[PDB]
Amino acid sequence: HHWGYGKHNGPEHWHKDFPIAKGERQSPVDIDTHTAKYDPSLKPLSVSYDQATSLRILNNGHAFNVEFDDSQDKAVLKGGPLDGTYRLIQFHFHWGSLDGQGSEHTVDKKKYAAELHLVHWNTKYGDFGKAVQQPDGLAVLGIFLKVGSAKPGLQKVVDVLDSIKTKGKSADFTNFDPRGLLPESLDYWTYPGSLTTPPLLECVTWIVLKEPISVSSEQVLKFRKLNFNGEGEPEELMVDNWRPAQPLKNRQIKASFK
Ligand SMILES: CCCCCCCCCCOS(N)(=O)=O
Ligand SMILES: [Cl-]
Ligand SMILES: [Zn+2]
């Protein structure tokens, strides 16, 4: 009985195996734009993905991960609310069964069609494993997806999904440039949170971009053709793999823009 997004193993069940699910800094959260406050102490955000080197794409039964070689100082996120440098290790998405839902974070309760998560770990901790044992071990750059014009830079990801339809399948995925998934503006909201999937560790500094990227209906429809199940098992489409907004508790969301 592994965790998932179904009626008997979904978000409302996670707290039993992962008590931190009801913690003090859980993610995602609803971003109340009027309550968010501009923070002058925030330094310029720096996203340097020029030397990013992807290696493989994997269907882990919950979503698909585009993995990067993080053995060297490449693809780093710094500045903004961050102290030090964070290295990109992988990115993945959360999406819905319909265009009207899919994102984890919401903006004034608005749900986007999907949400992209670029996961980075604080280099001061040596590697990802040690970083997830620290309150400032991770930084996730979240980007909303809305349905409209196609995102050219996402097509290579879309076209490889047919080869990793089921849980456990992976495929070579080199030379993918994540810069092609970024919106024009880097305006963002930030707050201290957690991983949105078990183990739900509270080690994340969330940086959620205000400007969504547009993807075509055809592109997201292909995301929805993936399977939660493994090969040879009854088909359960990989859709609605998002955790709903959690209590904000003793936290404040800061804006990088006035
Ligand atoms: C402690 C070992 C488990 C670490 C698992 C990390 C999964 C990270 C990806 C899922 O998180 S999210 N949605 O970006 O917040
Ligand atoms: Cl189901
Ligand atoms: Zn995620």
From Swiss-Prot:
UniProt cross-references to SUPFAM superfamilies, sorted A to Z: Carbonic anhydrase
Outcome (variant: residue 199 to A): Normal CO(2) hydrase activity, but impaired stability
GO BP: any one term: regulation of monoatomic anion transport
Comment on pH dependence: Optimum pH is 6-8.
Phosphoserine PTM positions: 163, 170
Effect of residue 62 to A: Reduced CO(2) hydrase activity, rescued by 4-methylimidazole (4-MI). Reduced proton transfer. Enhanced proton transfer. Enhanced proton transfer capacity
Protein name per Swiss-Prot or TrEMBL: Carbonic anhydrase 2
Taxonomic lineage: Eukaryota, Metazoa, Chordata, Craniata, Vertebrata
